[PDB]
């Protein structure tokens, strides 16, 4: 475990992370995709061997010894708000299980279902709160990755609010 488990936020490419493993915002079919997923495919293409997994699940595939946790959030274009919220919570619970199983001291995570799976809504708070519910019982250092300058400020404020 980390000596003093923390949350941090960085505004940069998750493919340049400084953590012991990465969470991919994957599609259910293990396809290269777009957004975070395309960056992950360019950096760790070997990790997409048999990476297909259902919505609300996570599947880890090694790239060398570096673990890529493929986590499949719901596309809110297809799910109801209610069923989508359940699947988004479940995907992050499966990420916490994988992070624990791997024995890593740190993990790079993106906010699931906030990009092309958001159904055109702002889901920063919804996705971040489900990340916290899952990851609070783990002792890995968590580093959240984002692209937008206003999202960086809001995520940082939410981390700081809990202290
Ligand atoms: C287009 N490439 C990327 C790479 N890393 C990201 C991390 C968080 C959100 C979006 C991101 N996009
Ligand atoms: Cl960058
Ligand atoms: Cl997304
Ligand atoms: Cl963002």
């Amino acid at each position: 475990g980390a000596m003093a488990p923390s949350y941090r936020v960085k505004r940069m490419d998750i493919a340049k992370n400084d953590e012991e493993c990465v969470v991919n915002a994957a599609n259910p079919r293990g396809l290269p995709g777009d957004g975070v997923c395309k960056a992950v495919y360019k950096k760790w293409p070997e990790s997409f061997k048999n990476s297909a997994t259902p919505v609300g699940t996570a599947k880890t595939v090694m790239c060398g010894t570096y673990p890529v946790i493929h986590a499949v959030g719901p596309n809110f274009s297809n799910y109801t708000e209610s069923e989508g919220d359940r699947e988004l919570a479940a995907a992050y619970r499966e990420v916490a299980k994988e992070v624990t199983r791997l024995g890593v001291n740190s993990v790079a995570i993106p906010l699931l279902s906030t990009g092309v799976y958001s159904g055109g809504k702002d889901r920063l708070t919804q996705s971040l709160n489900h990340l916290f519910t899952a990851m609070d019982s783990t002792d890995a250092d968590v580093v959240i990755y984002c692209r937008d300058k206003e999202w960086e400020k809001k995520i940082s404020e939410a981390i700081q609010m809990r202290t």
Side-chain angles (χ1 to χ4, degrees), residues 45-70:
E46 298 91 342
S47 73
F48 287 72
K49 196 147 167 270
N50 292 310
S51 63
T53 196
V55 172
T57 76
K59 184 164 200 195
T60 302
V61 184
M62 288 295 172
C63 176
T65 72
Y66 187 82
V68 176
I69 304 169
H70 300 272

mmCIF file with all atom_site columns, all heavy atoms in Angstrom, residues 45-70:
data_model
loop_
_atom_site.group_PDB
_atom_site.id
_atom_site.type_symbol
_atom_site.label_atom_id
_atom_site.label_alt_id
_atom_site.label_comp_id
_atom_site.label_asym_id
_atom_site.label_entity_id
_atom_site.label_seq_id
_atom_site.pdbx_PDB_ins_code
_atom_site.Cartn_x
_atom_site.Cartn_y
_atom_site.Cartn_z
_atom_site.occupancy
_atom_site.B_iso_or_equiv
_atom_site.pdbx_formal_charge
_atom_site.auth_seq_id
_atom_site.auth_comp_id
_atom_site.auth_asym_id
_atom_site.auth_atom_id
_atom_site.pdbx_PDB_model_num
ATOM 1   N N   . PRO A 1 45 ? -0.753  -1.161  -26.991 1.00 0.00 ? 45 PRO A N   1
ATOM 2   C CA  . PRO A 1 45 ? -1.635  -1.930  -27.876 1.00 0.00 ? 45 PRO A CA  1
ATOM 3   C C   . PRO A 1 45 ? -1.720  -3.414  -27.535 1.00 0.00 ? 45 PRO A C   1
ATOM 4   O O   . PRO A 1 45 ? -2.787  -4.025  -27.720 1.00 0.00 ? 45 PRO A O   1
ATOM 5   C CB  . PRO A 1 45 ? -0.975  -1.727  -29.261 1.00 0.00 ? 45 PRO A CB  1
ATOM 6   C CG  . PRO A 1 45 ? 0.447   -1.361  -28.953 1.00 0.00 ? 45 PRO A CG  1
ATOM 7   C CD  . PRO A 1 45 ? 0.335   -0.479  -27.719 1.00 0.00 ? 45 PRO A CD  1
ATOM 8   N N   . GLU A 1 46 ? -0.653  -3.970  -26.967 1.00 0.00 ? 46 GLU A N   1
ATOM 9   C CA  . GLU A 1 46 ? -0.611  -5.393  -26.555 1.00 0.00 ? 46 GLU A CA  1
ATOM 10  C C   . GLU A 1 46 ? -1.701  -5.674  -25.505 1.00 0.00 ? 46 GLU A C   1
ATOM 11  O O   . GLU A 1 46 ? -2.092  -6.837  -25.319 1.00 0.00 ? 46 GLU A O   1
ATOM 12  C CB  . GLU A 1 46 ? 0.760   -5.770  -26.022 1.00 0.00 ? 46 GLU A CB  1
ATOM 13  C CG  . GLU A 1 46 ? 1.892   -5.621  -27.044 1.00 0.00 ? 46 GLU A CG  1
ATOM 14  C CD  . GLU A 1 46 ? 2.600   -4.263  -27.054 1.00 0.00 ? 46 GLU A CD  1
ATOM 15  O OE1 . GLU A 1 46 ? 2.026   -3.279  -26.525 1.00 0.00 ? 46 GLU A OE1 1
ATOM 16  O OE2 . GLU A 1 46 ? 3.765   -4.161  -27.586 1.00 0.00 ? 46 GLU A OE2 1
ATOM 17  N N   . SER A 1 47 ? -2.137  -4.653  -24.764 1.00 0.00 ? 47 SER A N   1
ATOM 18  C CA  . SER A 1 47 ? -3.110  -4.869  -23.672 1.00 0.00 ? 47 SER A CA  1
ATOM 19  C C   . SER A 1 47 ? -4.519  -5.094  -24.238 1.00 0.00 ? 47 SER A C   1
ATOM 20  O O   . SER A 1 47 ? -5.421  -5.341  -23.435 1.00 0.00 ? 47 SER A O   1
ATOM 21  C CB  . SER A 1 47 ? -3.123  -3.749  -22.643 1.00 0.00 ? 47 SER A CB  1
ATOM 22  O OG  . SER A 1 47 ? -3.720  -2.594  -23.147 1.00 0.00 ? 47 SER A OG  1
ATOM 23  N N   . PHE A 1 48 ? -4.725  -4.967  -25.532 1.00 0.00 ? 48 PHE A N   1
ATOM 24  C CA  . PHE A 1 48 ? -6.073  -5.128  -26.129 1.00 0.00 ? 48 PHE A CA  1
ATOM 25  C C   . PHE A 1 48 ? -6.278  -6.566  -26.616 1.00 0.00 ? 48 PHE A C   1
ATOM 26  O O   . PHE A 1 48 ? -7.357  -6.854  -27.096 1.00 0.00 ? 48 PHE A O   1
ATOM 27  C CB  . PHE A 1 48 ? -6.315  -4.103  -27.223 1.00 0.00 ? 48 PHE A CB  1
ATOM 28  C CG  . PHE A 1 48 ? -6.545  -2.716  -26.684 1.00 0.00 ? 48 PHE A CG  1
ATOM 29  C CD1 . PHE A 1 48 ? -5.499  -1.973  -26.137 1.00 0.00 ? 48 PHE A CD1 1
ATOM 30  C CD2 . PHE A 1 48 ? -7.797  -2.130  -26.729 1.00 0.00 ? 48 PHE A CD2 1
ATOM 31  C CE1 . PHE A 1 48 ? -5.712  -0.699  -25.635 1.00 0.00 ? 48 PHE A CE1 1
ATOM 32  C CE2 . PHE A 1 48 ? -7.999  -0.834  -26.286 1.00 0.00 ? 48 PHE A CE2 1
ATOM 33  C CZ  . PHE A 1 48 ? -6.964  -0.138  -25.691 1.00 0.00 ? 48 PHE A CZ  1
ATOM 34  N N   . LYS A 1 49 ? -5.330  -7.451  -26.379 1.00 0.00 ? 49 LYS A N   1
ATOM 35  C CA  . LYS A 1 49 ? -5.583  -8.904  -26.594 1.00 0.00 ? 49 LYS A CA  1
ATOM 36  C C   . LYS A 1 49 ? -6.656  -9.439  -25.649 1.00 0.00 ? 49 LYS A C   1
ATOM 37  O O   . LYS A 1 49 ? -6.411  -9.530  -24.433 1.00 0.00 ? 49 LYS A O   1
ATOM 38  C CB  . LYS A 1 49 ? -4.313  -9.725  -26.404 1.00 0.00 ? 49 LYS A CB  1
ATOM 39  C CG  . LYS A 1 49 ? -4.442  -11.125 -26.999 1.00 0.00 ? 49 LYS A CG  1
ATOM 40  C CD  . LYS A 1 49 ? -3.134  -11.656 -27.561 1.00 0.00 ? 49 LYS A CD  1
ATOM 41  C CE  . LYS A 1 49 ? -3.193  -13.140 -27.860 1.00 0.00 ? 49 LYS A CE  1
ATOM 42  N NZ  . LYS A 1 49 ? -2.783  -13.926 -26.673 1.00 0.00 ? 49 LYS A NZ  1
ATOM 43  N N   . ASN A 1 50 ? -7.833  -9.808  -26.185 1.00 0.00 ? 50 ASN A N   1
ATOM 44  C CA  . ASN A 1 50 ? -8.929  -10.389 -25.365 1.00 0.00 ? 50 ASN A CA  1
ATOM 45  C C   . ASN A 1 50 ? -9.304  -9.447  -24.203 1.00 0.00 ? 50 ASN A C   1
ATOM 46  O O   . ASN A 1 50 ? -9.506  -9.919  -23.063 1.00 0.00 ? 50 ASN A O   1
ATOM 47  C CB  . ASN A 1 50 ? -8.541  -11.765 -24.821 1.00 0.00 ? 50 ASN A CB  1
ATOM 48  C CG  . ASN A 1 50 ? -8.443  -12.780 -25.938 1.00 0.00 ? 50 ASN A CG  1
ATOM 49  O OD1 . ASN A 1 50 ? -9.353  -12.893 -26.748 1.00 0.00 ? 50 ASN A OD1 1
ATOM 50  N ND2 . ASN A 1 50 ? -7.334  -13.502 -25.997 1.00 0.00 ? 50 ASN A ND2 1
ATOM 51  N N   . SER A 1 51 ? -9.441  -8.163  -24.512 1.00 0.00 ? 51 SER A N   1
ATOM 52  C CA  . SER A 1 51 ? -9.837  -7.135  -23.515 1.00 0.00 ? 51 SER A CA  1
ATOM 53  C C   . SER A 1 51 ? -11.352 -6.876  -23.531 1.00 0.00 ? 51 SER A C   1
ATOM 54  O O   . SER A 1 51 ? -11.868 -6.177  -22.621 1.00 0.00 ? 51 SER A O   1
ATOM 55  C CB  . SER A 1 51 ? -9.073  -5.833  -23.709 1.00 0.00 ? 51 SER A CB  1
ATOM 56  O OG  . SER A 1 51 ? -9.352  -5.256  -24.967 1.00 0.00 ? 51 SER A OG  1
ATOM 57  N N   . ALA A 1 52 ? -12.110 -7.440  -24.464 1.00 0.00 ? 52 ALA A N   1
ATOM 58  C CA  . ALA A 1 52 ? -13.577 -7.274  -24.479 1.00 0.00 ? 52 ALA A CA  1
ATOM 59  C C   . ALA A 1 52 ? -14.192 -7.745  -23.170 1.00 0.00 ? 52 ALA A C   1
ATOM 60  O O   . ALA A 1 52 ? -13.779 -8.791  -22.625 1.00 0.00 ? 52 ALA A O   1
ATOM 61  C CB  . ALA A 1 52 ? -14.171 -8.048  -25.636 1.00 0.00 ? 52 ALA A CB  1
ATOM 62  N N   . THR A 1 53 ? -15.123 -6.973  -22.622 1.00 0.00 ? 53 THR A N   1
ATOM 63  C CA  . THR A 1 53 ? -15.781 -7.256  -21.337 1.00 0.00 ? 53 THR A CA  1
ATOM 64  C C   . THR A 1 53 ? -17.082 -6.468  -21.291 1.00 0.00 ? 53 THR A C   1
ATOM 65  O O   . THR A 1 53 ? -17.216 -5.435  -21.915 1.00 0.00 ? 53 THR A O   1
ATOM 66  C CB  . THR A 1 53 ? -14.792 -6.966  -20.186 1.00 0.00 ? 53 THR A CB  1
ATOM 67  O OG1 . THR A 1 53 ? -15.213 -7.548  -18.958 1.00 0.00 ? 53 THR A OG1 1
ATOM 68  C CG2 . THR A 1 53 ? -14.508 -5.487  -19.993 1.00 0.00 ? 53 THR A CG2 1
ATOM 69  N N   . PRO A 1 54 ? -18.092 -6.932  -20.553 1.00 0.00 ? 54 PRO A N   1
ATOM 70  C CA  . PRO A 1 54 ? -19.378 -6.241  -20.540 1.00 0.00 ? 54 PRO A CA  1
ATOM 71  C C   . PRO A 1 54 ? -19.388 -4.898  -19.825 1.00 0.00 ? 54 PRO A C   1
ATOM 72  O O   . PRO A 1 54 ? -18.497 -4.539  -19.010 1.00 0.00 ? 54 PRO A O   1
ATOM 73  C CB  . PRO A 1 54 ? -20.340 -7.184  -19.817 1.00 0.00 ? 54 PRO A CB  1
ATOM 74  C CG  . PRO A 1 54 ? -19.586 -8.456  -19.581 1.00 0.00 ? 54 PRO A CG  1
ATOM 75  C CD  . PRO A 1 54 ? -18.124 -8.222  -19.844 1.00 0.00 ? 54 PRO A CD  1
ATOM 76  N N   . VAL A 1 55 ? -20.442 -4.150  -20.065 1.00 0.00 ? 55 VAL A N   1
ATOM 77  C CA  . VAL A 1 55 ? -20.661 -2.883  -19.329 1.00 0.00 ? 55 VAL A CA  1
ATOM 78  C C   . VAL A 1 55 ? -20.690 -3.178  -17.835 1.00 0.00 ? 55 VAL A C   1
ATOM 79  O O   . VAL A 1 55 ? -21.301 -4.192  -17.421 1.00 0.00 ? 55 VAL A O   1
ATOM 80  C CB  . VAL A 1 55 ? -21.955 -2.197  -19.824 1.00 0.00 ? 55 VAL A CB  1
ATOM 81  C CG1 . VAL A 1 55 ? -22.306 -0.984  -18.958 1.00 0.00 ? 55 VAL A CG1 1
ATOM 82  C CG2 . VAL A 1 55 ? -21.756 -1.782  -21.266 1.00 0.00 ? 55 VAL A CG2 1
ATOM 83  N N   . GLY A 1 56 ? -20.119 -2.263  -17.040 1.00 0.00 ? 56 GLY A N   1
ATOM 84  C CA  . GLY A 1 56 ? -20.147 -2.372  -15.571 1.00 0.00 ? 56 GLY A CA  1
ATOM 85  C C   . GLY A 1 56 ? -19.083 -3.307  -15.025 1.00 0.00 ? 56 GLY A C   1
ATOM 86  O O   . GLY A 1 56 ? -19.173 -3.645  -13.826 1.00 0.00 ? 56 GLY A O   1
ATOM 87  N N   . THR A 1 57 ? -18.149 -3.762  -15.849 1.00 0.00 ? 57 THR A N   1
ATOM 88  C CA  . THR A 1 57 ? -17.043 -4.674  -15.474 1.00 0.00 ? 57 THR A CA  1
ATOM 89  C C   . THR A 1 57 ? -15.687 -4.066  -15.803 1.00 0.00 ? 57 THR A C   1
ATOM 90  O O   . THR A 1 57 ? -15.598 -3.040  -16.532 1.00 0.00 ? 57 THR A O   1
ATOM 91  C CB  . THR A 1 57 ? -17.193 -6.058  -16.130 1.00 0.00 ? 57 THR A CB  1
ATOM 92  O OG1 . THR A 1 57 ? -16.826 -6.007  -17.518 1.00 0.00 ? 57 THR A OG1 1
ATOM 93  C CG2 . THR A 1 57 ? -18.571 -6.630  -15.912 1.00 0.00 ? 57 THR A CG2 1
ATOM 94  N N   . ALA A 1 58 ? -14.640 -4.675  -15.240 1.00 0.00 ? 58 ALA A N   1
ATOM 95  C CA  . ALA A 1 58 ? -13.252 -4.337  -15.575 1.00 0.00 ? 58 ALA A CA  1
ATOM 96  C C   . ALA A 1 58 ? -12.475 -5.618  -15.827 1.00 0.00 ? 58 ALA A C   1
ATOM 97  O O   . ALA A 1 58 ? -12.711 -6.642  -15.140 1.00 0.00 ? 58 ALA A O   1
ATOM 98  C CB  . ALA A 1 58 ? -12.592 -3.530  -14.482 1.00 0.00 ? 58 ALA A CB  1
ATOM 99  N N   . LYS A 1 59 ? -11.626 -5.571  -16.818 1.00 0.00 ? 59 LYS A N   1
ATOM 100 C CA  . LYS A 1 59 ? -10.777 -6.717  -17.197 1.00 0.00 ? 59 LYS A CA  1
ATOM 101 C C   . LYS A 1 59 ? -9.351  -6.213  -17.338 1.00 0.00 ? 59 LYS A C   1
ATOM 102 O O   . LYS A 1 59 ? -9.105  -5.279  -18.124 1.00 0.00 ? 59 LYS A O   1
ATOM 103 C CB  . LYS A 1 59 ? -11.253 -7.323  -18.507 1.00 0.00 ? 59 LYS A CB  1
ATOM 104 C CG  . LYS A 1 59 ? -10.463 -8.563  -18.884 1.00 0.00 ? 59 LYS A CG  1
ATOM 105 C CD  . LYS A 1 59 ? -11.185 -9.339  -19.952 1.00 0.00 ? 59 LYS A CD  1
ATOM 106 C CE  . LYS A 1 59 ? -10.681 -10.761 -19.964 1.00 0.00 ? 59 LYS A CE  1
ATOM 107 N NZ  . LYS A 1 59 ? -11.081 -11.469 -21.198 1.00 0.00 ? 59 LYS A NZ  1
ATOM 108 N N   . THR A 1 60 ? -8.398  -6.824  -16.618 1.00 0.00 ? 60 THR A N   1
ATOM 109 C CA  . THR A 1 60 ? -6.987  -6.421  -16.684 1.00 0.00 ? 60 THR A CA  1
ATOM 110 C C   . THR A 1 60 ? -6.259  -7.279  -17.725 1.00 0.00 ? 60 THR A C   1
ATOM 111 O O   . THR A 1 60 ? -6.396  -8.532  -17.679 1.00 0.00 ? 60 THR A O   1
ATOM 112 C CB  . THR A 1 60 ? -6.280  -6.568  -15.333 1.00 0.00 ? 60 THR A CB  1
ATOM 113 O OG1 . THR A 1 60 ? -7.027  -5.739  -14.427 1.00 0.00 ? 60 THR A OG1 1
ATOM 114 C CG2 . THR A 1 60 ? -4.831  -6.117  -15.389 1.00 0.00 ? 60 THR A CG2 1
ATOM 115 N N   . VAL A 1 61 ? -5.462  -6.622  -18.533 1.00 0.00 ? 61 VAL A N   1
ATOM 116 C CA  . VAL A 1 61 ? -4.514  -7.258  -19.476 1.00 0.00 ? 61 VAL A CA  1
ATOM 117 C C   . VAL A 1 61 ? -3.159  -6.597  -19.325 1.00 0.00 ? 61 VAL A C   1
ATOM 118 O O   . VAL A 1 61 ? -3.045  -5.389  -19.352 1.00 0.00 ? 61 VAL A O   1
ATOM 119 C CB  . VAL A 1 61 ? -5.012  -7.220  -20.935 1.00 0.00 ? 61 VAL A CB  1
ATOM 120 C CG1 . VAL A 1 61 ? -4.017  -7.977  -21.838 1.00 0.00 ? 61 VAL A CG1 1
ATOM 121 C CG2 . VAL A 1 61 ? -6.418  -7.768  -21.066 1.00 0.00 ? 61 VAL A CG2 1
ATOM 122 N N   . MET A 1 62 ? -2.124  -7.421  -19.197 1.00 0.00 ? 62 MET A N   1
ATOM 123 C CA  . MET A 1 62 ? -0.731  -6.946  -19.056 1.00 0.00 ? 62 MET A CA  1
ATOM 124 C C   . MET A 1 62 ? -0.226  -6.430  -20.408 1.00 0.00 ? 62 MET A C   1
ATOM 125 O O   . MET A 1 62 ? -0.603  -6.973  -21.480 1.00 0.00 ? 62 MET A O   1
ATOM 126 C CB  . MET A 1 62 ? 0.191   -8.062  -18.547 1.00 0.00 ? 62 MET A CB  1
ATOM 127 C CG  . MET A 1 62 ? -0.018  -8.422  -17.094 1.00 0.00 ? 62 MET A CG  1
ATOM 128 S SD  . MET A 1 62 ? 0.402   -7.048  -15.994 1.00 0.00 ? 62 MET A SD  1
ATOM 129 C CE  . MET A 1 62 ? -0.180  -7.700  -14.429 1.00 0.00 ? 62 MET A CE  1
ATOM 130 N N   . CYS A 1 63 ? 0.586   -5.381  -20.348 1.00 0.00 ? 63 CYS A N   1
ATOM 131 C CA  . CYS A 1 63 ? 1.459   -4.945  -21.454 1.00 0.00 ? 63 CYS A CA  1
ATOM 132 C C   . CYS A 1 63 ? 2.866   -5.078  -20.887 1.00 0.00 ? 63 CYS A C   1
ATOM 133 O O   . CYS A 1 63 ? 3.265   -4.246  -20.046 1.00 0.00 ? 63 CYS A O   1
ATOM 134 C CB  . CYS A 1 63 ? 1.148   -3.512  -21.873 1.00 0.00 ? 63 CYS A CB  1
ATOM 135 S SG  . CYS A 1 63 ? 2.280   -2.903  -23.157 1.00 0.00 ? 63 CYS A SG  1
ATOM 136 N N   . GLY A 1 64 ? 3.572   -6.167  -21.198 1.00 0.00 ? 64 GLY A N   1
ATOM 137 C CA  . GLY A 1 64 ? 4.794   -6.493  -20.461 1.00 0.00 ? 64 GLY A CA  1
ATOM 138 C C   . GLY A 1 64 ? 4.447   -6.851  -19.049 1.00 0.00 ? 64 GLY A C   1
ATOM 139 O O   . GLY A 1 64 ? 3.659   -7.801  -18.848 1.00 0.00 ? 64 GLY A O   1
ATOM 140 N N   . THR A 1 65 ? 4.911   -6.114  -18.045 1.00 0.00 ? 65 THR A N   1
ATOM 141 C CA  . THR A 1 65 ? 4.501   -6.263  -16.656 1.00 0.00 ? 65 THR A CA  1
ATOM 142 C C   . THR A 1 65 ? 3.612   -5.085  -16.222 1.00 0.00 ? 65 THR A C   1
ATOM 143 O O   . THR A 1 65 ? 3.291   -5.022  -15.010 1.00 0.00 ? 65 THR A O   1
ATOM 144 C CB  . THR A 1 65 ? 5.653   -6.382  -15.648 1.00 0.00 ? 65 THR A CB  1
ATOM 145 O OG1 . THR A 1 65 ? 6.312   -5.117  -15.489 1.00 0.00 ? 65 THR A OG1 1
ATOM 146 C CG2 . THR A 1 65 ? 6.625   -7.458  -16.064 1.00 0.00 ? 65 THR A CG2 1
ATOM 147 N N   . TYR A 1 66 ? 3.244   -4.207  -17.143 1.00 0.00 ? 66 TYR A N   1
ATOM 148 C CA  . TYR A 1 66 ? 2.467   -2.980  -16.784 1.00 0.00 ? 66 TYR A CA  1
ATOM 149 C C   . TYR A 1 66 ? 0.972   -3.293  -16.937 1.00 0.00 ? 66 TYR A C   1
ATOM 150 O O   . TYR A 1 66 ? 0.512   -3.593  -18.052 1.00 0.00 ? 66 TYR A O   1
ATOM 151 C CB  . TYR A 1 66 ? 2.905   -1.801  -17.637 1.00 0.00 ? 66 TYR A CB  1
ATOM 152 C CG  . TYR A 1 66 ? 2.265   -0.497  -17.198 1.00 0.00 ? 66 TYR A CG  1
ATOM 153 C CD1 . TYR A 1 66 ? 2.791   0.221   -16.126 1.00 0.00 ? 66 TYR A CD1 1
ATOM 154 C CD2 . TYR A 1 66 ? 1.138   -0.004  -17.830 1.00 0.00 ? 66 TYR A CD2 1
ATOM 155 C CE1 . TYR A 1 66 ? 2.204   1.401   -15.694 1.00 0.00 ? 66 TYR A CE1 1
ATOM 156 C CE2 . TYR A 1 66 ? 0.558   1.201   -17.415 1.00 0.00 ? 66 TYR A CE2 1
ATOM 157 C CZ  . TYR A 1 66 ? 1.088   1.885   -16.334 1.00 0.00 ? 66 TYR A CZ  1
ATOM 158 O OH  . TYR A 1 66 ? 0.522   3.072   -15.933 1.00 0.00 ? 66 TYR A OH  1
ATOM 159 N N   . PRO A 1 67 ? 0.159   -3.240  -15.851 1.00 0.00 ? 67 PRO A N   1
ATOM 160 C CA  . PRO A 1 67 ? -1.262  -3.643  -15.950 1.00 0.00 ? 67 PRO A CA  1
ATOM 161 C C   . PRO A 1 67 ? -2.144  -2.524  -16.533 1.00 0.00 ? 67 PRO A C   1
ATOM 162 O O   . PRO A 1 67 ? -2.005  -1.343  -16.144 1.00 0.00 ? 67 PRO A O   1
ATOM 163 C CB  . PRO A 1 67 ? -1.720  -3.897  -14.528 1.00 0.00 ? 67 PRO A CB  1
ATOM 164 C CG  . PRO A 1 67 ? -0.467  -3.864  -13.675 1.00 0.00 ? 67 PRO A CG  1
ATOM 165 C CD  . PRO A 1 67 ? 0.547   -3.043  -14.446 1.00 0.00 ? 67 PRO A CD  1
ATOM 166 N N   . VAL A 1 68 ? -2.957  -2.898  -17.530 1.00 0.00 ? 68 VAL A N   1
ATOM 167 C CA  . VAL A 1 68 ? -3.995  -2.002  -18.102 1.00 0.00 ? 68 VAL A CA  1
ATOM 168 C C   . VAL A 1 68 ? -5.346  -2.556  -17.681 1.00 0.00 ? 68 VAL A C   1
ATOM 169 O O   . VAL A 1 68 ? -5.729  -3.699  -18.052 1.00 0.00 ? 68 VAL A O   1
ATOM 170 C CB  . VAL A 1 68 ? -3.865  -1.896  -19.635 1.00 0.00 ? 68 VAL A CB  1
ATOM 171 C CG1 . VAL A 1 68 ? -5.010  -1.044  -20.196 1.00 0.00 ? 68 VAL A CG1 1
ATOM 172 C CG2 . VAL A 1 68 ? -2.493  -1.382  -20.075 1.00 0.00 ? 68 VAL A CG2 1
ATOM 173 N N   . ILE A 1 69 ? -6.098  -1.813  -16.865 1.00 0.00 ? 69 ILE A N   1
ATOM 174 C CA  . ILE A 1 69 ? -7.401  -2.251  -16.333 1.00 0.00 ? 69 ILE A CA  1
ATOM 175 C C   . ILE A 1 69 ? -8.433  -1.636  -17.281 1.00 0.00 ? 69 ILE A C   1
ATOM 176 O O   . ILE A 1 69 ? -8.670  -0.442  -17.228 1.00 0.00 ? 69 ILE A O   1
ATOM 177 C CB  . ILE A 1 69 ? -7.576  -1.786  -14.882 1.00 0.00 ? 69 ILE A CB  1
ATOM 178 C CG1 . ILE A 1 69 ? -6.434  -2.256  -13.974 1.00 0.00 ? 69 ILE A CG1 1
ATOM 179 C CG2 . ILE A 1 69 ? -8.923  -2.237  -14.400 1.00 0.00 ? 69 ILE A CG2 1
ATOM 180 C CD1 . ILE A 1 69 ? -6.445  -1.600  -12.610 1.00 0.00 ? 69 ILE A CD1 1
ATOM 181 N N   . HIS A 1 70 ? -9.027  -2.441  -18.127 1.00 0.00 ? 70 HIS A N   1
ATOM 182 C CA  . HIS A 1 70 ? -10.074 -1.975  -19.069 1.00 0.00 ? 70 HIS A CA  1
ATOM 183 C C   . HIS A 1 70 ? -11.409 -1.895  -18.365 1.00 0.00 ? 70 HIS A C   1
ATOM 184 O O   . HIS A 1 70 ? -12.009 -2.966  -18.088 1.00 0.00 ? 70 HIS A O   1
ATOM 185 C CB  . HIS A 1 70 ? -10.150 -2.870  -20.312 1.00 0.00 ? 70 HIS A CB  1
ATOM 186 C CG  . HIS A 1 70 ? -8.888  -2.924  -21.094 1.00 0.00 ? 70 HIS A CG  1
ATOM 187 N ND1 . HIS A 1 70 ? -8.601  -2.026  -22.076 1.00 0.00 ? 70 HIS A ND1 1
ATOM 188 C CD2 . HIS A 1 70 ? -7.866  -3.808  -21.047 1.00 0.00 ? 70 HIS A CD2 1
ATOM 189 C CE1 . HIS A 1 70 ? -7.438  -2.349  -22.611 1.00 0.00 ? 70 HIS A CE1 1
ATOM 190 N NE2 . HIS A 1 70 ? -6.955  -3.453  -22.004 1.00 0.00 ? 70 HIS A NE2 1
#
